[PDB]
Design a protein around this ligand. Structure first.
Ligand code: ONW
Length: 341
């Protein structure tokens, strides 16, 4: 009886995906979850992860490749790879040349989640919910503190977002952009932020304990759906702001020391089935990377422009680039200053 160890983001699979896979294959799955690319990167760089499959964002996977922590995927063992959208593959290939190591899973944007009724109560019916001004303008964040503000604990994403908002290159390579204007704005906003966290904001939005957050798109749409099913009167929405936003592509990868690679390939092939991955999108409110799966995705998810955004919105999205050690050091130091103080 072989097993399979999977490490994925929290709130990123359907409730029955693993159980259905177990029943069909007789494999027992050990499934654990994270909410931080930094936590996963640290595990991969410090020693064995103990997992057969892990799911980093592609921009982090680029750095992980330089350490040799993944096994190149045997495409002969992934017959339905063709189901993957070739345009998303090409974007991920910027981080993973010729798509040797990573299987695109889901993708979304880093935008603004908010409580519709509370934001209009505080900022009025003309609140700029289509703009990063809603939370990155100090005058606005000071008022929204009344009902709670959270930021992702995602340093590379938050700094890229702030740099873009400031009219800088989102992937600026000038240290002074981080230590000066980016830090200046974040510290002006810092007094109004209740916490930095990358998963507690989902239920807090759903229960009405925070009213605005920097959040991941599908996470916020999950919060909205949780509130509706609870019939608690909380109306949550998500915005991809007009100034653009970061896009991310989360990918399955196979640690080089994975014990049960054959079982791992069986699970990747299971995910490449259009019906399996469309069912996941239906429950987690994320766009998958499977072009063959799109007709099976529920209308509610597939037609949500905050999940599958239209071309004019996609044209304003940016992606993270890997920085050299100098900028990495300055960004991390600045992040700690922003959070603590
Ligand atoms: C659904 O297929 C299109 C996939 O586009 C992904 C978006 C983020 O890229 C467009 C920008 C990044 N150049």
């Amino acid at each position: 009886q072989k097993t399979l160890h999977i490490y994925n983001w929290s709130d990123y699979i359907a409730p029955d995906t693993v159980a259905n896979f177990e029943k069909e294959t007789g494999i027992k799955v050990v499934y654990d979850v994270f909410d931080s690319n930094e936590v996963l990167e640290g595990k991969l760089m410090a020693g064995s992860t103990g997992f057969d499959l892990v799911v980093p964002s592609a921009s982090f996977l680029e750095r992980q490749l330089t350490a040799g922590v993944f096994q190149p995927l045997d495409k002969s063992k992934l017959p339905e790879w063709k189901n993957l959208d070739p345009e998303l593959l090409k974007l991920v290939a910027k981080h993973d040349p010729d798509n040797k190591f990573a299987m695109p899973y889901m993708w979304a944007t880093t935008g603004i989640g908010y409580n519709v009724d509370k934001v209009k109560a505080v900022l009025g019916e003309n609140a700029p919910v289509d703009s990063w001004d809603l939370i990155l303008k100090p005058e606005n964040l000071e008022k929204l503190k009344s009902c709670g503000v959270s930021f992702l604990d995602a340093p590379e994403e938050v700094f890229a977002t702030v740099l873009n908002y400031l009219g800088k290159d989102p992937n600026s390579t000038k240290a002074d952009d981080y230590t000066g204007p980016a830090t200046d704005l974040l510290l002006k906003l810092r007094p109004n932020i209740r916490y930095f966290h990358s998963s507690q904001y989902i239920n807090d939005l759903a229960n009405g304990d925070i009213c605005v957050a920097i959040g991941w798109a599908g996470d916020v749409w999950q919060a909205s759906n949780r509130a509706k099913e609870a019939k608690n009167g909380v109306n949550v929405s998500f915005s991809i702001p007009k100034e653009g936003a970061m896009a991310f592509f989360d990918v399955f990868a196979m640690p080089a020391d994975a014990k049960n690679k054959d079982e791992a390939y069986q699970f990747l092939n299971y995910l490449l089935r259009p019906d399996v991955v469309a069912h996941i999108s239906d429950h987690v409110f994320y766009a998958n990377a499977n072009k063959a799966a799109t007709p099976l995705v529920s209308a509610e998810v597939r037609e949500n422009p905050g999940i599958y955004p239209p071309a004019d919105v996609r044209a304003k999205l940016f992606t993270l680039k890997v920085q050299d050690p100098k900028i990495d050091r300055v960004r991390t130091r600045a992040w700690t200053k922003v959070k603590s103080g």
